[PDB]
Amino acid sequence: YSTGSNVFQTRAGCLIGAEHVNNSYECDIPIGAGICASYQTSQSIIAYTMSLGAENSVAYSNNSIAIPTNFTISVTTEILP
Amino acid sequence: CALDPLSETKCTLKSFTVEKGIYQTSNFRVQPTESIVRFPNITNLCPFG
Amino acid sequence: LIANQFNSAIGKIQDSLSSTPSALGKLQDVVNQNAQALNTLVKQLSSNFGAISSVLNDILSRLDPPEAEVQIDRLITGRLQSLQTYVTQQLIRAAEIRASANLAATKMSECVLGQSKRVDFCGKGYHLMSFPQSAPHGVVFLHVTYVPAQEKNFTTAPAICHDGKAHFPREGVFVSNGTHWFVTQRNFYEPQIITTDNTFVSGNCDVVIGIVNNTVYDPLQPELDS
Amino acid sequence: VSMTKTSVDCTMYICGDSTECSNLLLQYGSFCTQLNRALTGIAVEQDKNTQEVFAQVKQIYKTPPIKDFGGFNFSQILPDPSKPSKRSPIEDLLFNKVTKFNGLTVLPPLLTDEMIAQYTSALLAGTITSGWTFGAGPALQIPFPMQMAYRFNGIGVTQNVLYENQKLIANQFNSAIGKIQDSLSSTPSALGKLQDVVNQNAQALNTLVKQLSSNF
Amino acid sequence: RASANLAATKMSECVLGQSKRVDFCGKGYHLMSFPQSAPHGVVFLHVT
Ligand SMILES: *[C@@H]1O[C@H](CO)[C@@H](O[C@@H]2O[C@H](CO)[C@@H](O)[C@H](O)[C@H]2NC(C)=O)[C@H](O)[C@H]1NC(C)=O
Ligand SMILES: *[C@@H]1O[C@H](CO)[C@@H](O)[C@H](O)[C@H]1NC(C)=O
Ligand SMILES: *[C@@H]1O[C@H](CO)[C@@H](O)[C@H](O)[C@H]1NC(C)=O
Ligand SMILES: *[C@@H]1O[C@H](CO)[C@@H](O)[C@H](O)[C@H]1NC(C)=O
Ligand SMILES: *[C@@H]1O[C@H](CO)[C@@H](O)[C@H](O)[C@H]1NC(C)=O
Ligand SMILES: *[C@@H]1O[C@H](CO)[C@@H](O)[C@H](O)[C@H]1NC(C)=O
Ligand SMILES: *[C@@H]1O[C@H](CO)[C@@H](O)[C@H](O)[C@H]1NC(C)=O
Ligand SMILES: *[C@@H]1O[C@H](CO)[C@@H](O)[C@H](O)[C@H]1NC(C)=O
Structure with missing residues (x-):
C-alpha cells in the first residue's frame, strides 16, 4: 500500500492500512509486541492494544468468602492428535 | 500477485480464499539511494603544479 | 437438573462442532502439516537441484552414463537432502505426536478410566468424566467438568470459639449470612448448623487470630433430658 | 517457557544484495519455504507456549489496595508501583541477572514483558485472594x-497447625522469601536454566553468522 | 515446548491448585506456587 494511509507505529513495526484504536479489544490477528488487529465497524481494519481480559478486582478481605450456590456441568471438548 | 497485499497473500498461500490471520508475504528492503566512494589524499601527487 | 444440563451440554457440543469449521483445529492442523510435508516432498521432484532436468527418465534418455552420472548425482544429492529433511521433520513431528499420544493415553487413563484430581488437566474445572470419541487420526474427549456459577459473598472466620476451645471445620468452610454462622462445603453453598460432628476441637481460643465467638450444637443433651 | x-x-x-545467488537458490526448490514455515511455526509455538503457561487466567485480577494478609509478606513477589515497570522486586532481579543483522530478525514476543508481568500479577492476585478457585471457574x-x-x-496436615501457628508460619514463609531474594542476588548460578537457554540461542545465532565467514 | 507444557501443568496444578504429585512442585509436601516472570521463561516459588 501507498504510504500515509492511516499509518500507525508500534514496537513490532510500522503498521500501515489499519487505524489505531485507543479502546482495547480481544486479540484476533496478533500483530506482535502487544498489538492485535480485528475487522470491526463503514468497515475497516483496526489495530489495538491487547485486552488480556476484563479487569476484575476480587473483593478480598480478611473475612470475605464467596461460596457458589449453583453449578454448570459443562462438557469441554478437548481435541488431541 | 503485485496488485495488492491481498493478492500477494493469495500467491504466497497458493489459495484464492485466505483465512483471517497474518502472513509473512515478503521482506521490506530499503535500496541504496546513491553510491559514495572515499579514498585518501593522493600521496604521490605528480608535480604538475 | 444435572441430567438435563449434561444433555444440553452435549447438544451444544454437537451444534458448536457443526457450526464452527475450526472446531477440530488441532486435528486439521496435523493433517494439513502432514499433507504440506508430503506435497513439498513431491514438489522437490520437480526442482532441478542444479541438474539439467528434474525428471530422471529424461536425463537417462538424454545423457550417456559417463556424464549422465554427474547430473543423476546432483539429483540424488538434492532429493536425498529433501528426503532427509522430510524424514527429520517427520521424526520431530512424530515425537510431538507421541507426546500428544502419551498425553491422550494419560487423559484416557485417569479421566476416562478414572477421575483426575490434576487441575485443568482434563477440562477447565473440577473434572468429572471424559468420553473418548474417535476422530480422524486422533481422539476427542468430552471432559465433563463441574464449573460453579453463582457465587454469594459471605463473612468467614478461620475458627469458631465455643466454651473457650477453638472449633475448626472438619470439612468445609465457616461462613455466615449475618448473625447466623454456618459451615459449608467448599464448592457448593449448603449451609449446615454447626455441630461437633463436622467440627473438631483444636487448642485454645486465644492462639488463633480471627476466631469469632459462636455456639456449636451438640446432639447429646436433647436425648439426655428425655 | x-x-x-x-x-x-x-x-x-x-x-546478500546479489541476485545471481538468489537465482541459483531458486533452482534448489522450496527448502527455504520449508525453513521459513518451520521457523514461523516455532515462533507461533513460542507465543502459544507463553499463552498456555501464563494465560490460564481469563480475567486479569488486581491485588487489593491493603495487604492485610494475616502476616504474610508478598512485597517481594507482588508488583512494585515505585518502579516504572510493574514488576516485582524478585522479578526485577530476575530480569537483571539474565543477560546480528544478516536476515536474522528477532520477532518481538506477542506478549510484551509488561503484559507477561500483568498475567503473572493476575495469577498472583488470584492465588492470594481466591486460591485454586480462580482456575476452575469464577474467582472466589x-x-x-x-x-x-x-x-x-x-x-x-489438619488445619490445627496453621491457625495455632499463624505468626510462626508467616515468619517462616517471609524469611524463606527473603532467603530466595538473597540467594538470587548473590549467587549468579541461580538462573542456570534460563541463562543456558539464552546462551544457547545466542551462540547458535552467532555460529550461524560466523558460517558466513566459512569458505565451505 | 516440553518444558513449557511442564510449566503450564505446574501452574495448573500448583498455582491454580494444590498438586499431590510427590516432588512435582518442590521437594516436600507442596503448598502453593507463585509464578514470577523471567526473561524467556518462568520462575516458580514452590512453597513446600
Ligand atoms: C441453577 O442453574 C440452572 C441452570 O444453569 C437453573 O436451571 C434453570 O431454571 C430455570 C427456571 O427454574 C429454567 O427456566 C431453565 O430452563 C433452567 N435451565 C436448565 C439448563 O435446566 C436453576 O434454576 C439454577 N438454580 C438452582 C437452584 O438450581
Ligand atoms: C487516543 O488518545 C490520545 C491521547 O492524547 C489521543 O491523542 C488520540 O487522538 C486518541 N485516539 C483515538 C482514536 O481516540
Ligand atoms: C600554480 O602554482 C601553484 C604554486 O603555488 C601550484 O600549487 C598550482 O598547482 C599551479 N597550477 C597549475 C595548474 O599547475
Ligand atoms: C460481594 O461482597 C461484598 C462485601 O463487601 C458485598 O457488598 C457484595 O454485595 C457482594 N457481591 C454480591 C454480588 O453480592
Ligand atoms: C440468614 O440465615 C438465617 C437462617 O435461618 C435466616 O433465618 C435469616 O433470615 C438469614 N438472613 C439474615 C439477614 O439473617
Ligand atoms: C481485618 O482487617 C481490618 C482492617 O483491614 C481490621 O480492622 C480487622 O480487625 C481485621 N479482622 C480480622 C478478623 O482479621
Ligand atoms: C468472646 O467472649 C469473651 C468473653 O469475655 C470476650 O473476652 C472475647 O473478646 C469474645 N470474642 C470476640 C471475638 O469478641
Ligand atoms: C511485609 O513485607 C515486608 C517484607 O518484610 C515487610 O517489611 C513489610 O512491613 C510487610 N508489609 C506490610 C504492608 O506490612
Whole structure:
C-alpha cells in the first residue's frame, strides 16, 4: 500500500492500512509486541492494544468468602492428535 | 500477485480464499539511494603544479 | 437438573462442532502439516537441484552414463537432502505426536478410566468424566467438568470459639449470612448448623487470630433430658 | 517457557544484495519455504507456549489496595508501583541477572514483558485472594490464612497447625522469601536454566553468522 | 515446548491448585506456587 494511509507505529513495526484504536479489544490477528488487529465497524481494519481480559478486582478481605450456590456441568471438548 | 497485499497473500498461500490471520508475504528492503566512494589524499601527487 | 444440563451440554457440543469449521483445529492442523510435508516432498521432484532436468527418465534418455552420472548425482544429492529433511521433520513431528499420544493415553487413563484430581488437566474445572470419541487420526474427549456459577459473598472466620476451645471445620468452610454462622462445603453453598460432628476441637481460643465467638450444637443433651 | 522468538529468511541470509545467488537458490526448490514455515511455526509455538503457561487466567485480577494478609509478606513477589515497570522486586532481579543483522530478525514476543508481568500479577492476585478457585471457574475471594489452612488440609496436615501457628508460619514463609531474594542476588548460578537457554540461542545465532565467514 | 507444557501443568496444578504429585512442585509436601516472570521463561516459588 501507498504510504500515509492511516499509518500507525508500534514496537513490532510500522503498521500501515489499519487505524489505531485507543479502546482495547480481544486479540484476533496478533500483530506482535502487544498489538492485535480485528475487522470491526463503514468497515475497516483496526489495530489495538491487547485486552488480556476484563479487569476484575476480587473483593478480598480478611473475612470475605464467596461460596457458589449453583453449578454448570459443562462438557469441554478437548481435541488431541 | 503485485496488485495488492491481498493478492500477494493469495500467491504466497497458493489459495484464492485466505483465512483471517497474518502472513509473512515478503521482506521490506530499503535500496541504496546513491553510491559514495572515499579514498585518501593522493600521496604521490605528480608535480604538475 | 444435572441430567438435563449434561444433555444440553452435549447438544451444544454437537451444534458448536457443526457450526464452527475450526472446531477440530488441532486435528486439521496435523493433517494439513502432514499433507504440506508430503506435497513439498513431491514438489522437490520437480526442482532441478542444479541438474539439467528434474525428471530422471529424461536425463537417462538424454545423457550417456559417463556424464549422465554427474547430473543423476546432483539429483540424488538434492532429493536425498529433501528426503532427509522430510524424514527429520517427520521424526520431530512424530515425537510431538507421541507426546500428544502419551498425553491422550494419560487423559484416557485417569479421566476416562478414572477421575483426575490434576487441575485443568482434563477440562477447565473440577473434572468429572471424559468420553473418548474417535476422530480422524486422533481422539476427542468430552471432559465433563463441574464449573460453579453463582457465587454469594459471605463473612468467614478461620475458627469458631465455643466454651473457650477453638472449633475448626472438619470439612468445609465457616461462613455466615449475618448473625447466623454456618459451615459449608467448599464448592457448593449448603449451609449446615454447626455441630461437633463436622467440627473438631483444636487448642485454645486465644492462639488463633480471627476466631469469632459462636455456639456449636451438640446432639447429646436433647436425648439426655428425655 | 519460550525461546527467543526468532525468524530467519534465506533470501537475505544465504544471498546478500546479489541476485545471481538468489537465482541459483531458486533452482534448489522450496527448502527455504520449508525453513521459513518451520521457523514461523516455532515462533507461533513460542507465543502459544507463553499463552498456555501464563494465560490460564481469563480475567486479569488486581491485588487489593491493603495487604492485610494475616502476616504474610508478598512485597517481594507482588508488583512494585515505585518502579516504572510493574514488576516485582524478585522479578526485577530476575530480569537483571539474565543477560546480528544478516536476515536474522528477532520477532518481538506477542506478549510484551509488561503484559507477561500483568498475567503473572493476575495469577498472583488470584492465588492470594481466591486460591485454586480462580482456575476452575469464577474467582472466589478467600482470606489467605484460610486458603493456606486448606493447603495444609490438602497435604494431610489438619488445619490445627496453621491457625495455632499463624505468626510462626508467616515468619517462616517471609524469611524463606527473603532467603530466595538473597540467594538470587548473590549467587549468579541461580538462573542456570534460563541463562543456558539464552546462551544457547545466542551462540547458535552467532555460529550461524560466523558460517558466513566459512569458505565451505 | 516440553518444558513449557511442564510449566503450564505446574501452574495448573500448583498455582491454580494444590498438586499431590510427590516432588512435582518442590521437594516436600507442596503448598502453593507463585509464578514470577523471567526473561524467556518462568520462575516458580514452590512453597513446600
Ligand atoms: C441453577 O442453574 C440452572 C441452570 O444453569 C437453573 O436451571 C434453570 O431454571 C430455570 C427456571 O427454574 C429454567 O427456566 C431453565 O430452563 C433452567 N435451565 C436448565 C439448563 O435446566 C436453576 O434454576 C439454577 N438454580 C438452582 C437452584 O438450581
Ligand atoms: C487516543 O488518545 C490520545 C491521547 O492524547 C489521543 O491523542 C488520540 O487522538 C486518541 N485516539 C483515538 C482514536 O481516540
Ligand atoms: C600554480 O602554482 C601553484 C604554486 O603555488 C601550484 O600549487 C598550482 O598547482 C599551479 N597550477 C597549475 C595548474 O599547475
Ligand atoms: C460481594 O461482597 C461484598 C462485601 O463487601 C458485598 O457488598 C457484595 O454485595 C457482594 N457481591 C454480591 C454480588 O453480592
Ligand atoms: C440468614 O440465615 C438465617 C437462617 O435461618 C435466616 O433465618 C435469616 O433470615 C438469614 N438472613 C439474615 C439477614 O439473617
Ligand atoms: C481485618 O482487617 C481490618 C482492617 O483491614 C481490621 O480492622 C480487622 O480487625 C481485621 N479482622 C480480622 C478478623 O482479621
Ligand atoms: C468472646 O467472649 C469473651 C468473653 O469475655 C470476650 O473476652 C472475647 O473478646 C469474645 N470474642 C470476640 C471475638 O469478641
Ligand atoms: C511485609 O513485607 C515486608 C517484607 O518484610 C515487610 O517489611 C513489610 O512491613 C510487610 N508489609 C506490610 C504492608 O506490612
